[PDB]
Amino acid sequence: LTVKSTKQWTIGTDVQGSERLNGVSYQEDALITYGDYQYVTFYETAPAGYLNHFVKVGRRRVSPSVGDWEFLTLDDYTQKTMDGHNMISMGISGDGKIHLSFDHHDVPINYRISKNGIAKDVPSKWTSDLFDPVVHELVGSQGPYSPLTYPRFEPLGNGDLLLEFRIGQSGSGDSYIHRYSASTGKWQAYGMYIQGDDNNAYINGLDYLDGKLYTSWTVRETPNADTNHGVYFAYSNDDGKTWFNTNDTKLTKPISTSDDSTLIWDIPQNSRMVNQEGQLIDTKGRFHILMRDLLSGEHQYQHYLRKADGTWTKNAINPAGLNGPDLYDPRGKLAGDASGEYLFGILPDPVKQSTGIYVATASKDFKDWKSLAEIPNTSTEPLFDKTRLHESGILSVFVRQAGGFPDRKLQVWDFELDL
Numbered sequence: 001l002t003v004k005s006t007k008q009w010t011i012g013t014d015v016q017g018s019e020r021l022n023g024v025s026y027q028e029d030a031l032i033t034y035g036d037y038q039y040v041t042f043y044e045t046a047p048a049g050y051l052n053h054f055v056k057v058g059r060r061r062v063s064p065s066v067g068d069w070e071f072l073t074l075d076d077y078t079q080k081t082m083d084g085h086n087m088i089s090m091g092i093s094g095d096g097k098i099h100l101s102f103d104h105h106d107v108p109i110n111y112r113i114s115k116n117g118i119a120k121d122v123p124s125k126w127t128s129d130l131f132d133p134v135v136h137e138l139v140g141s142q143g144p145y146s147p148l149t150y151p152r153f154e155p156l157g158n159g160d161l162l163l164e165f166r167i168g169q170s171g172s173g174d175s176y177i178h179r180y181s182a183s184t185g186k187w188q189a190y191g192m193y194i195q196g197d198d199n200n201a202y203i204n205g206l207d208y209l210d211g212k213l214y215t216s217w218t219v220r221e222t223p224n225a226d227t228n229h230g231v232y233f234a235y236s237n238d239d240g241k242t243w244f245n246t247n248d249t250k251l252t253k254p255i256s257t258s259d260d261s262t263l264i265w266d267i268p269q270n271s272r273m274v275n276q277e278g279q280l281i282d283t284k285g286r287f288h289i290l291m292r293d294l295l296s297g298e299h300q301y302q303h304y305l306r307k308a309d310g311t312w313t314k315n316a317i318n319p320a321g322l323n324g325p326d327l328y329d330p331r332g333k334l335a336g337d338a339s340g341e342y343l344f345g346i347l348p349d350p351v352k353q354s355t356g357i358y359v360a361t362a363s364k365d366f367k368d369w370k371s372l373a374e375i376p377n378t379s380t381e382p383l384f385d386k387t388r389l390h391e392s393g394i395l396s397v398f399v400r401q402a403g404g405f406p407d408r409k410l411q412v413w414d415f416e417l418d419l
């Protein structure tokens with residue numbers, strides 16, 4: 001496997017602040033291909049300057065040929081909270097509508113949707129008028145909408161879109177799912193699907209394949225990040241209403257963080273494992289988790305694998321040259337190709353201030369981690385475009401550079417693979 005070509009584009013100047021607001025691990029998602037176009041969302045500084053930001057949405061044609069980016073600026077909502085939780089997630093439903101939810105740390109939902117199905121019936125003009133106003137509810141559904149953190153979207157097989165988030169706080173919170181119908185344009189409440197018990201679950205993402213929805217998490221006792229413990233897993237066969245553990249045992253609704261039956265690896269507190277890192281269902285139905293810990297005596301990224309025979313394995317990701325991360329260092333992701341043979345670790349290196357692209361193969365039990373490429377000059381939790389990789393064999397990664405404001409840019413990097 002080789003990188004046929006490497007290309008990059010600078011899409012904006014990052015915003016100034018001691019917190020990172022662009023390029024955050026739990027953006028789900030930041031960079032999305034739908035049809036012949038790729039979309040990206042990020043904050044850029046408003047004319048009022050420091051601590052005033054607008055959400056931007058970029059689009060570019062990627063098929064049959066790659067076109068230039070164009071951007072719209074949502075200049076009717078000013079982000080002002082210098083808090084790294086307050087990121088943007090985007091989703092695109094099967095009616096072609098683009099959804100955005102953003103700017104939360106334990107506050108009411110902020111959500112907006114495009115007026116029309118702009119990703120399906122593609123308009124000539126890319127302007128802010130394409131979007132409806134910010135609202136603080138989900139039409140057709142019901143609260144609670146506050147105190148909300150961590151909006152995550154997941155597109156389903158019938159064109160519908162899940163929106164998932166935590167209601168509560170670090171160390172005492174629960175998570176909820178809502179479902180947007182592409183046929184009616186209405187949201188519906190699926191209710192609380194995971195319930196804390198003087199703690200909160202921190203999921204790594206949502207993954208969906210062939211009618212099944214997969215998630216993994218750690219449990220946090222207090223606002224101190226050293227109090228994460230456990231690696232847990234569950235899946236649903238009905239888009240988040242009913243859940244099962246790794247042994248196919250049906251779980252209570254909601255899943256309780258006190259239910260040990262979803263635990264797949266014992267990791268104590270003070271292991272230097274961080275919440276909300278990465279996960280992946282590969283196209284062959286193998287489930288993967290990316291975390292980190294100090295338990296070997298060295299800080300190392302860790303790969304958890306749910307094998308076909310039901311067994312789980314854990315193996316350090318330690319290819320030559322990769323510096324292992326401690327608790328507060330930037331978090332990585334796992335990507336997979338259409339065939340399911342290639343597993344990509346998109347791993348920020350805290351020493352090099354760059355993002356490494358490493359590859360392992362299913363034929364070698366994913367133990368053959370090899371350096372494949374690098375994105376230089378990043379201070380980012382890298383995020384990729386699942387659909388572009390599956391459809392075109394191009395690994396496309398959104399990054400925040402390292403360096404100082406206003407030199408520090410936002411970029412998209414495309415690694416064309418010889419798949």
Ligand SMILES: *[C@@H]1O[C@H](CO)[C@@H](O[C@@H]2O[C@H](CO)[C@@H](O[C@@H]3O[C@H](CO[C@H]4O[C@H](CO[C@H]5O[C@H](CO)[C@@H](O)[C@H](O)[C@@H]5O)[C@@H](O)[C@H](O[C@H]5O[C@H](CO)[C@@H](O)[C@H](O)[C@@H]5O)[C@@H]4O)[C@@H](O)[C@H](O[C@H]4O[C@H](CO)[C@@H](O)[C@H](O)[C@@H]4O)[C@@H]3O)[C@H](O)[C@H]2NC(C)=O)[C@H](O)[C@H]1NC(C)=O
Pocket residue numbers: 246247263264265266267268295311312314
């Ligand atoms: C339902 O699903 C669950 C989840 O998959 C399943 O439970 C697993 O069952 C398998 C098979 O019986 C267990 O696998 C064995 O594990 C042996 C060691 O287990 C200990 O270590 C686990 C790993 O953590 C270690 O390392 C970390 C650092 O990464 C460290 O923090 C830990 O402390 C520990 O050192 C650990 O998760 C596990 O904890 C469970 O069990 C204890 C009690 O023992 C409990 O207190 C915990 O709360 C938790 O439930 C435990 O501490 C391992 O030696 C053994 O290896 C042999 O077999 C393999 C075969 O592949 C050989 O390769 C190998 O050489 C040995 O011969 C084997 O891998 C696994 O531990 C269970 N996992 C959990 C989370 O419980 C249930 O069985 C399923 N139930 C049904 C009905 O289907």
Ligand SMILES: C[C@@H]1O[C@@H](O)[C@H](O)[C@H](O)[C@H]1O
Pocket residue numbers: 084085170225274275276
């Ligand atoms: C460790 C800490 O945990 C949560 O508060 C968020 O994920 C935050 O981004 C991370 O820095």
Ligand SMILES: [Ca+2]
Pocket residue numbers: 028153154205206207208
């Ligand atoms: Ca996802």
Ligand code: NA
Pocket residue numbers: 171172198199221222
């Ligand atoms: Na608590």
